[PDB]
Design a protein around this ligand. Sequence first.
Ligand SMILES: Nc1ncnc2c1ncn2[C@@H]1O[C@H](CSCC[C@H](N)C(=O)O)[C@@H](O)[C@H]1O
Ligand SMILES: Nc1ncnc2c1ncn2[C@@H]1O[C@H](CSCC[C@H](N)C(=O)O)[C@@H](O)[C@H]1O
Ligand SMILES: [Mg+2]
Ligand SMILES: [Mg+2]
Lengths: 242, 242
Amino acid sequence: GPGMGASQDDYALIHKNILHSEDLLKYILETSVYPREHEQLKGLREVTEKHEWSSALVAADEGLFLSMLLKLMNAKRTIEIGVYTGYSLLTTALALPEDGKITAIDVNKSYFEIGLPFIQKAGVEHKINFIESEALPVLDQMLQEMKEEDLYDFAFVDADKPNYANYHERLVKLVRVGGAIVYDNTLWFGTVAFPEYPGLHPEEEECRVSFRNLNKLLAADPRVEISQVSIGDGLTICRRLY
Amino acid sequence: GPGMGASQDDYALIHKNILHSEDLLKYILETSVYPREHEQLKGLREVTEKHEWSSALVAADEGLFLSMLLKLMNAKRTIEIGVYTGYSLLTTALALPEDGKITAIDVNKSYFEIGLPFIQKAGVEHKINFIESEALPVLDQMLQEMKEEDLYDFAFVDADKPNYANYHERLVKLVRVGGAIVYDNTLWFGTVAFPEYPGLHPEEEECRVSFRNLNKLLAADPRVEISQVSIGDGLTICRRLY
Ligand SMILES: Nc1ncnc2c1ncn2[C@@H]1O[C@H](CSCC[C@H](N)C(=O)O)[C@@H](O)[C@H]1O
Ligand SMILES: Nc1ncnc2c1ncn2[C@@H]1O[C@H](CSCC[C@H](N)C(=O)O)[C@@H](O)[C@H]1O
Ligand SMILES: [Mg+2]
Ligand SMILES: [Mg+2]
């Protein structure tokens, strides 16, 4: 409608955690994450923590885990769907080798412009091709243009959660055999464990439903092998088998 | 501990979880783990769940994650410290290529023999060189014989938890540059988040203190990059930089 959309202040889940206690998550961040966090990632996180959609920001411990995965698999060409202010994007660009290439897709370039100065200061702007667009049309055009030699090593999916199953049908063809697709937020604040969950915002309830469907679909999908990981808000790593 | 020491019934922490919802952990297992668990892994887990040291068994969602890491990094030669009934060992042997090789070290061969029939029926016993011994003498001899061309790609450390920092000093020389060292249980039931934690068996208290010291050590160690991951009982992935 012409009015203002829902704000995260209208959401019921934003103060929820999947870990046992706030103290345990704080321990992980202070002990194992902040001492290992790039100065420009720390700056980007601190600005984003103030932003109207801060609850969408990828967790910082999850960021270091994505970095580790990219380095262990020697990824060099990646795609990111859902950029926001650029925390996972800057994480990825810092992790890739100097000639690494990232295709980054978001509908909102104004969000990306918040993180862009941090990306520039980190020296990794040259690795990023930012596409201001809804992701599905971009992915569908890639299916017509891209050749086998151009396939992606790694995909991070963190945009509009109800569309994940649709993204999957494209990305399992756009990531190479043996490549990885990582879907963020697949435990959705712990709500996926319940067939009914009271008092959610309609937009939060739509994601509870879509993630329960997606988690079943990925578990049954013979094109990939999976690992669901209780880090951050949950993520699911998919490895393409054929 | 399972190696030696007090019995499991003497411990306080065995039923505690790092996730705040038992429903959520069951959801992950029922949705994303059991449908993807090898038949022989299922049988080995079911017998081990009845064993007197069942609390030491690696979590099954953690197992799929270790498998994913091994495949994405194209591991071919690995070392395991702490075998118990062999769940992580079988997971690793199933993940590796057909000519992959595992060095498996445990003080108690009788535990390994509980799992061996499942490993044999899975057809991957041939990848495993089991060494019945304390781990520290084995690693010290390996530093005596190890050639650069034979460095391990991957190490899983899951044995006697107070010795991890000692294991680390050898493993950062026995794993290749860019190889991974994974330390299991680094969140120790969540107790690491507290400077004091009443109500623990003395062996459990010793691990709380040792993991608190280890987590600081790894976060400050310039020889590796790290990611601490809140899966299972917590684990820390280390990547050797030089
Ligand atoms: N259909 C769509 N196509 C592309 N981007 C979309 C989209 N729908 C929503 N988005 C974008 O997806 C982003 C999700 S938040 C992304 C978080 C970010 N990856 C981080 O590391 O913090 C938002 O910026 C939103 O604008
Ligand atoms: N000093 C030591 N050297 C080698 N093994 C040891 C050891 N101290 C204890 N252990 C062994 O380490 C094991 C820890 S439990 C290991 C769990 C196993 N990796 C799994 O996947 O389930 C026990 O079997 C114990 O016997
Ligand atoms: Mg997210
Ligand atoms: Mg363990």
